[PDB]
Chain A
């Protein structure tokens, strides 16, 4: 019965990632004064299916790899981590209810740079390796503000428990006491997933260009699973919905609408801005987000003490 619950988690993940590609092409279409796909299916609803079947019978690109083993391991690690980030998510009840789910997600997202690094070294292109090193340095840079912002928010929660974060936000959204943390958090999640305006793997080579159409599609769907997941996590973390315990589907509808709007906000940010130069988002992290993040971490340490608003441990 638990295996049914695991499958009803992870097969809808793959379906939502499949149709997120359609939603991105359509929304980026209408924001660019054109249409998106509307020929292949009715309203383009068969475009992800057609594209999956196209990519899974395309010729293998057949690279000469420096390592065969890490070239196999990098998509496996990417998909495994992108599927295990979902299991503590309280929506309203997590699959795995763990006491330290926030730190679990921070750890499993910190492990996601090995897929980039191993795929960059497993290619024989030196320029692909340079791009992989830039992508890893970007991701580990923004993980610093992820961890410190996330700590500063959970100083209002009381624990690392993700389900407690719903109880924390029953009277007000947590974006009201922590909107500067929310906006630096949101741009840091935008820079974690290598999402525009932080997508330098498409700014003028990607780390995974030596993969065939199948494995590059697996990297791509792990990336969009990370995108939907971080939007759900940001929704749980700052926009926590009403939860009637006798009617859990009210919370499920509410966090689903908010997470969809936040994923469309990712789609709407990539339809609006040019890219950063690489040093410019390094400047954005180290010289702008990190001093404010340390200052607000001092503020959110000292603030529950000075107002007598320390959250409970349990």
Chain B
């Protein structure tokens, strides 16, 4: 597990680098704390028009204006 590894690093350093970089690419996004922010930034990107809701009278979480407090915010993106 250690003599074989030094053997293949002596013989085939191209392939050892290949399998090592591939293993990092596989396992490292599951261990990264910033994988969540990739998802959060891709859903924060407004490609479509924010089609507004008809005010039935009881929607306390939906704002009446963009500058209202309620609604989704992007403080985390400006700060990080």
- Contact partner of A298 among B17, B25, B38, B42, CB < 8 A? B25
A3 contacts B by Cβ under 8 Å: no
CA distance A117 to B75 in the complex (A): 59
- Contact partner of A299 among B21, B34, B42, B45, CB < 8 A? B21
From A213-221, A237-245, A258-266, A303-311, the one touching the partner chain is: A303-311
CA distance A308 to B34 in the complex (A): 6
B8 contacts A by Cβ under 8 Å: no
Among residues of A, the one whose C-beta sits closest to the C-beta of B17 is A292
Query: How would residues 15 to 34 of chain B score, 1 for a CB under 8 Å from any chain A CB and 0 otherwise?
Result: 10111111011101100101
A295 engages B17 (CB within 8 Å): yes
A302 engages B29 (CB within 8 Å): yes
Number of interface residues of B (CB under 8 A): 21
CA distance A306 to B26 in the complex (A): 11
Q: Which residues of A contact B17 (CB under 8 A)?
A: 292, 295
B22 engages A295 (CB within 8 Å): yes
B37 contacts A by Cβ under 8 Å: yes
CA distance A302 to B30 in the complex (A): 10
Among residues of A, the one whose C-beta sits closest to the C-beta of B32 is A306
Among residues of B, the one whose C-beta sits closest to the C-beta of A296 is B21
Q: Closest approach, in angstroms, between the C-beta of B17 and any C-beta of chain A?
A: 6
A310 engages B38 (CB within 8 Å): yes
Contacts A306-B28, A306-B35, A307-B32; A298 near B41 (Cβ below 8 A): no
Q: Closest approach, in angstroms, between the C-beta of B57 and any C-beta of chain A?
A: 38
B18 engages A305 (CB within 8 Å): no
B22 engages A305 (CB within 8 Å): no
Pairs A–B under 8 Å by Cβ, sample size 22: A287-B14, A292-B21, A294-B18, A295-B17, A295-B19, A295-B20, A295-B21, A295-B25, A298-B21, A298-B25, A299-B22, A301-B25, A302-B25, A302-B28, A302-B29, A303-B25, A305-B29, A305-B35, A305-B38, A310-B38, A310-B42, A312-B45
A288 contacts B by Cβ under 8 Å: yes
A308 engages B18 (CB within 8 Å): no
B-binding residues in A (CB < 8 A):
287-288, 291-292, 294-296, 298-299, 301-308, 310, 312
Among residues of A, the one whose C-beta sits closest to the C-beta of B42 is A310
CA distance A190 to B25 in the complex (A): 28
A288 engages B25 (CB within 8 Å): no
CA distance A287 to B14 in the complex (A): 9
Among residues of B, the one whose C-beta sits closest to the C-beta of A288 is B14
Q: Closest approach, in angstroms, between the C-beta of A133 and any C-beta of chain B?
A: 28
Q: Which residues of A contact B22 (CB under 8 A)?
A: 294-295, 298-299
CA distance A295 to B24 in the complex (A): 9
CA distance A44 to B3 in the complex (A): 60
CA distance A292 to B35 in the complex (A): 24
Q: Which residues of A contact B38 (CB under 8 A)?
A: 304-306, 308, 310
Q: Which residues of B contact A307 (CB under 8 A)?
A: 32, 34
- Contact partner of B29 among A291, A292, A306, A312, CB < 8 A? A306
Q: Which residues of A contact B34 (CB under 8 A)?
A: 306-308
CA distance A287 to B29 in the complex (A): 27
Contacts A306-B28, A306-B32; A292 near B18 (Cβ below 8 A): yes
CA distance A308 to B37 in the complex (A): 6
Q: Which residues of B contact A292 (CB under 8 A)?
A: 14, 17-18, 21
